[PDB]
Specification:
Rossmann fold, 5 helices, 6 strands, 27% strand, binds guanosine-5'-triphosphate, binds magnesium ion, hydrolase, activation, monomeric, GTPase NRas, EC 3.6.5.2
Length: 169
């Protein structure tokens, strides 16, 4: 059994908890339970491999920003979540991406860009800008909805495959 330390990051209210709870409970929360820090240990089969996922569901509220350095040190890969239809000029994705690079003193930390809430009205330009951002950064982009489950397994499993690749290199 192979272990993977995944961390879900992003601004408050973007859907980190809803994505995690879709994966582990097969349920859409349809409720905002603002996070401090929750940690899950889950045995999941990915590509036929039995995986132990240690998933840290982190706080996006700015009042909890001091907790970031600790979870960035321990995390092996990061889901960087934003609301596709409210990308805020990528400001939060850029800050989390830089903080991860600085804390881990590494330019190639496993990372997936997750554009969540794609069930809500979304402009073509915002979907295309997200795809071009991910291409510029050399990381995958996955469009998700915690409401419909679109993309949820793809986001988490893509991050696990990137950690596999990083380890094999
Ligand atoms: N329509 C829709 N609502 C969503 C989706 N994901 C989350 N929500 C809702 O958005 C709100 C915030 O979701 P959470 O997952 O709690 O947000 P979070 O990113 O964990 O927030 P913090 O823990 O405070 O950082 C809740 O009311 C969710 O039901 C989604 O894909 N679509
Ligand atoms: Mg949360």
């Amino acid at each position: 059994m192979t272990e993977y330390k995944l961390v879900v990051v992003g601004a408050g209210g973007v859907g980190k908890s809803a994505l995690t709870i879709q994966l582990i409970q097969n349920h859409f929360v349809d409720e905002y339970d603002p996070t401090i820090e929750d940690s899950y240990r889950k045995q999941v089969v990915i590509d036929g491999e039995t995986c132990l996922l240690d998933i840290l569901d982190t706080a996006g509220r700015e009042e909890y920003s001091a907790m970031r350095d600790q979870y960035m040190r321990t995390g092996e890969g990061f889901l960087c979540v934003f609301a596709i239809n409210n990308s805020k000029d990528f400001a939060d994705i850029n800050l989390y991406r830089e903080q991860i690079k600085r804390v881990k003193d590494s330019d190639d930390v496993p990372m997936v860009l997750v554009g969540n809430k794609c069930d809500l009205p979304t402009r073509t330009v915002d979907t295309k800008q997200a795809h071009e951002l991910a291409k510029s950064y050399g990381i995958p982009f996955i469009e998700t909805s915690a409401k419909t489950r679109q993309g949820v397994e793809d986001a988490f499993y893509t991050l696990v495959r990137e950690i596999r690749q990083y380890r094999m290199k």
